Design a binder for this molecule. Structure first.
Ligand SMILES: O=P(O)(O)OC[C@H]1O[C@H](OP(=O)(O)OP(=O)(O)O)[C@H](O)[C@@H]1O
Ligand SMILES: O=P(O)(O)OC[C@H]1O[C@H](OP(=O)(O)OP(=O)(O)O)[C@H](O)[C@@H]1O
Ligand SMILES: O=P(O)(O)OC[C@H]1O[C@H](OP(=O)(O)OP(=O)(O)O)[C@H](O)[C@@H]1O
Ligand SMILES: O=P(O)(O)OC[C@H]1O[C@H](OP(=O)(O)OP(=O)(O)O)[C@H](O)[C@@H]1O
Ligand SMILES: O=P(O)(O)OC[C@H]1O[C@H](OP(=O)(O)OP(=O)(O)O)[C@H](O)[C@@H]1O
Ligand SMILES: O=P(O)(O)OC[C@H]1O[C@H](OP(=O)(O)OP(=O)(O)O)[C@H](O)[C@@H]1O
Ligand SMILES: O=C(O)c1ccccc1C(=O)O
Ligand SMILES: O=C(O)c1ccccc1C(=O)O
Ligand SMILES: O=C(O)c1ccccc1C(=O)O
Ligand SMILES: O=C(O)c1ccccc1C(=O)O
Ligand SMILES: O=C(O)c1ccccc1C(=O)O
Ligand SMILES: O=C(O)c1ccccc1C(=O)O
Lengths: 270, 270, 270, 270, 270, 270
């Protein structure tokens, strides 16, 4: 299957791209004026070892900028420009009006660099956990970049990680909960059921064998401990120590997506 | 003066906030239903040493969520929760309907964490360069987060760095330029002038004493070398070696804003 | 708990209201001009037996039209104006500038009439099924009114029914499936898992004891037959015969929401 | 002439379609991922006797989903799948990427079902009134579905009915009017004239031979009684009794558009 | 009555204002930063003889910029700063945060200057025609400023002129018409009727006593010659000669709104 | 170079066009219905002596209306229909569906007429100043048409004038300044620098040899007197007297863009 198929042929994610171009040109592209519309060719370079992510998003930038692009690698491919003499790898060949190419350049690269950075981070941690013989799942969180959530959750997937719920309207989560606030797990979980119905899971962030059981009792579908039912462990986990997984179902962490370094990309005309 | 005064009392940056809340609740907040509207109090904690940034943005989230907030620190303040027993510092006190508080929580913290991360990174590098006796400026770039540019450039400022031009519609930049493509620096710079006029500067990314001079000749306002007039050095600079500044006017780097770690923040009800 | 708490204090649902007012006044309200801003009082009448639904939505219309409203009944209340001499019941008392009241009037009533119609339909069918001793759930579908989905799903809830998944991004559903198209239930269900992760359920529309088992095998969370696991029966069910429920978990039908009659409402000034 | 020609080649009605697709896919189409992009063929079935309406709207969904569609019937055609062995009639043949077809499916059918339901209702009542030898007009109202007004008014037209004014910015209507509130019909009608000018009609909802005459006096273009000049009768009329038309010009009723049942439609791949 | 009452308390015209502020501040108000939030007072001056128009629009700018404003004149008032020593007249007194005042300044004045310019032009021509004893109407056209149509039509009204139809969706107009294109006036007018119904007038741009009669025949509500029924004369009319009115009902001209000079306005702090 | 190259291949300026079409057709084009889709040909006429401006904007209207257009003149061309027998000049040849042509007509012409009017005004004043041997620049201002700023600034350029800064986020301007309000030019200019950085100029509206010098001192890039550094004179200048230029760098005036007459354009089908 192809990840980019998760994206509806049309929808808001495409207006996002447009909005991002506007963000770069509120009133006039001077550079395009000076450069003109002559057809040119260009190479899109990956300049660091990592996983290529964001292809369809960058593609959308290339389409709205009316350019012809040929990708040399499939999304998900691991790139190692280091084990290259030049230290860079051409991942795509682009042709079109000069001005168009330069207008797409920054925005497109801001997409790839960040998308790949996350894909790469996710992949390192999932494969790292997989190497210890862990059979469970590594997921993300809702601590995403305001307005960039679709792109980031998508990169998590390509990285080989679980995205965890998408937003507050998806799987319910009754988080630490003194504030949740009165009744019970048992009535907080009943109310949640009452509204979310059968098609959406309910997760409870418990604190004791009792807590959990009361949730399993109420019918919670997932149990969050935070230091037919599913067990999730979350909180300050990272590619570090940290190897301390055990037979618990889920391990969530923002480290795969928030605050992560980027994978450098580049674009130069023939 | 107050940085947040750079933000127009009303404008698109406020619709952004709204859009970000929608991004978190496409259809129903189940958690708010279960939690209810009872008034509660909560503390907003900074959980890592760093500079507090994003106050007005987080404030906008708190206003649209109709809450009462009292900030204990001014934006820009350096926080050191490490030199605290608990390892966390209350930066704001919030009151309002339970559901409202929990709805604002994630989005608000995604703002602060990232805004502060950048503010912090910028501040470290500017102060680091300042300690060596450098008198010039450290700037950012256009390699920003798609759709988050306003927030990121703003954080650069608070961090104590220059933002450099904002977008393609601001200071012109005739970048590496074989593609720029024919004529001269001299006619590329003339055309640019022809369109941008006197109120906006023109920068040329040169390669030789000649290149530069030809630009200084054409009237360029800034000279980019990239390894009454101004000299900018850019490319792969970071908090690392790297201390190799000299009397050149500008040093630009994405390290102060792109791929930077985040400053952890937290929110819990009384 | 209060249903209207499912709605985020702020989000796109409020811009919807605005857009709906624009839909009614593309360029000038002549009636408001002629009527003026004198303060007036008005009664909002329910003119048919049914369940009151859409309160917060109508409230939003009243707020943006800057009016003062006092509701005499809570959302969900069953109204029986028939068992009233006048044949109408005042559900709300409104005060404000004349023009404002008349501008809010139609839009507000279009909300209530439809919201209540659905609430009422849903309630009749759920209570009807409940009277036969059925313990399972009655749900809706995705056959909603383009652009009005939030309002309609919400009314389903108030009606006492399950909303079923909200959109294609929620619970996965592998519907009739020749088109789904090759591999297996088993690999269609694996791929779905691969993308949706643990926080979202997967439903398969099966055709045989085998089909189902293969799904239960693959790990499907729900089984749709369409004439720890859950059984759903769907297709042409209505308040009619039709009483033919049995111990299967879910019965979905658009009859509770699509093509339903409306509950008449009214508004007249003192 | 062709009804769909009423729709501007481009305008907001097309963004509506997009918005409706977003409404169905806030973040990821899982089904498309699993199904893939292989080309498939499909039949669009009408499953109930009624008039086909909404063609260009459904077409817009098919275009934005990049599919090839061939319609077998013209909009307005009366369909009678009942007088068919299978009980269904193929109204369109569609080809394109699997995922695209399934993404367009629901939204498209929600359009057709509702559009046809209204077209059908309108047509039944207009033809019903026409059979008694009535020569006047049957119109709709402003009690439309919030945000769907364009689609519904359009269906009224295809149904063979008058749409009546479109919104508050069109023909003025001085409705029951104690609230309209002081002066006269005569000065309310003068003020209205004062603002609307000659290109837009003014209607007054009168109560007595005097009322009307005073309006005809003031220059009203239409007279609404509500139980060179035109007479309109409105209020609780329906396909029921109700045959009680007489030589009055207009009979308005929401029954042709609000609360109406839908015409079932269907889509299955080869 | 009050003209500004034509504007719905809420609707798209208010988002327009916001959008206009964004147009002035894509990323940062530097001036506000430097000026600060200290409360200041300011006078809004009219600097040329003319009619004050655009009050509610400017008011909306002042509200979104959170300022306190007190108007010294009612909209429509004729101002003659020339017959003043200073040559300027204070039309409004404003108070609020410094930065806010300066941010509202330009946008607000761009509103007033243009709105008043049109109001003034319209008023001169209507009163000019009225002085010759003409009893008919002077109207505008659809040759308005892209995106500013609401503001301009509104100013026409205040100027004392007719706005004529608002857009293509209002009164139908079968303009010069070889292109309209085949059949007849008689079938073009029938088709138009067929779609627009009774609540909207149909105008035909005729060329001969026959043309007109055929239209009056078909049922046209207005007759446009262009050099119970109504006669309109249009084409190149202006405040110039040009006094050549006669007993024909309407005289339309863009001169009252398009290409018109502006009325200078000003704003300075205490 | 080509001016229209200043416009990004895609961005908000294109949504503007769409929005402008919606502004003309909120609900139904009756005229298109009656006219039909038959292919027709048409000539776009310039009806007054002036400079052709707005080509790409009008082109965008023609593209969204799906028409084929062939321009007979390049943007910037000076047209003199007066020195033509007919008194009109065909500037473009258009082909496409009848309805489409008529729908594009008004909006397109509203673009050209205004764009050319400004281009023409600007050109007259720049060439007028150039004829006296002035070597400096003539610029515009921020007194533009709300929402039309991009189109107007663009026309200024084609007219051969400087646009001056675009918005408040570009070149800083510390205008009359009692309100700016305390400290100094020297600290207002320092604060401005502090936020705008090196890539954006700072202009100070001075009053005395001292004022200026203090600014030149603080580092201002431009000096505005208003009756390596640059001198600007602004205030009430026009094509009138007024020839009183001297060796000062800039002369700004709204006369080239605000309140200017329009250049008449026309469109008729074969
Ligand atoms: O990998 P990590 O980034 O630690 O993310 C996971 C943790 O974050 C959440 O709590 P948190 O207290 O951080 O929510 P808050 O920031 O809104 O208060 C969650 O319950 C996890 O414990
Ligand atoms: O601190 P840094 O991130 O190195 O950013 C600064 C460098 O990036 C730019 O070139 P680059 O070749 O990166 O532009 P591209 O990525 O679009 O091709 C710029 O000319 C600088 O040399
Ligand atoms: O209560 P009801 O309205 O019957 O809704 C429920 C039925 O509709 C769906 O199939 P359907 O074949 O109707 O989907 P389609 O219309 O897109 O092809 C679904 O599988 C159910 O069988
Ligand atoms: O066919 P019907 O649905 O009866 O629609 C027609 C009636 O509705 C209107 O009054 P109504 O009192 O319903 O307006 P309101 O609901 O806003 O108060 C109108 O004056 C008609 O009498
Ligand atoms: O006062 P005025 O500006 O002359 O406006 C009025 C005239 O403009 C229209 O025709 P026109 O041929 O101008 O329409 P076009 O510009 O789209 O072809 C209209 O039929 C009037 O004759
Ligand atoms: O060519 P002109 O239209 O005169 O434009 C130029 C003048 O306008 C500005 O001041 P102004 O006092 O007009 O700003 P205000 O209208 O906002 O108060 C500016 O300082 C110039 O002096
Ligand atoms: O964002 C968070 O706090 C979070 C952290 C870990 C898992 C899930 C979530 C979530 O909210 O969905
Ligand atoms: O984004 C970049 O490539 C860039 C890098 C360094 C300085 C400035 C910029 C800029 O484009 O403004
Ligand atoms: O809309 C449908 O076809 C549908 C019908 C019954 C249940 C669920 C759904 C759904 O798609 O979620
Ligand atoms: O919506 C209504 O109340 C209404 C009812 C009947 C005719 C016309 C209308 C109308 O408002 O245009
Ligand atoms: O804009 C025009 O061409 C026009 C000119 C004169 C009157 C009316 C109109 C109109 O179209 O409504
Ligand atoms: O708009 C103005 O007041 C103005 C007037 C003259 C030059 C520049 C400007 C400007 O603000 O940029």
């Amino acid at each position: 299957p192809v990840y980019e198929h998760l994206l509806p042929v049309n929808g808001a994610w495409r207006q996002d791209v447009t909005n991002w171009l506007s963000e770069d040109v509120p009133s006039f592209d001077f550079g395009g004026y000076v450069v003109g519309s002559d057809l040119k060719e260009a190479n899109l370079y990956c300049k660091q070892d990592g996983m290529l992510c964001g292809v369809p998003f960058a593609q959308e930038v290339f389409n709205q900028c009316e350019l012809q692009v040929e990708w040399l690698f499939k999304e998900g491919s691991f790139l190692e420009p280091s084990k290259n003499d030049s230290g860079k790898i051409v991942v795509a060949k682009i042709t079109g009006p000069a001005k168009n190419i330069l207008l797409a350049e920054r925005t497109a690269l801001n997409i790839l660099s960040r998308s790949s950075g996350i894909a790469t981070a996710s992949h390192k941690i999932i494969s790292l956990a997989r190497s210890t013989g862990y059979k469970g799942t590594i997921a993300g969180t809702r601590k995403t970049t305001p307005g960039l959530r679709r792109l980031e959750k998508y990169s998590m997937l390509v990285g080989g990680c679980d995205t965890h719920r998408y937003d507050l309207s998806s799987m319910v989560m009754l988080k630490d909960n003194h504030i949740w606030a009165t009744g019970s797990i048992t009535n907080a979980v009943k109310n949640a059921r009452a509204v979310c119905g059968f098609a959406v899971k309910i997760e409870v962030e418990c604190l004791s064998e009792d807590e959990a059981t009361e949730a399993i009792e109420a019918g919670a579908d997932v149990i969050m401990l935070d230091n037919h039912f599913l067990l999730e462990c979350s909180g300050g986990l990272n590619l570090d120590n940290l190897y301390l997984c055990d037979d618990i179902d889920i391990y969530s962490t923002s480290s795969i997506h928030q605050g992560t370094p980027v994978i450098d990309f580049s674009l130069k005309l023939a």
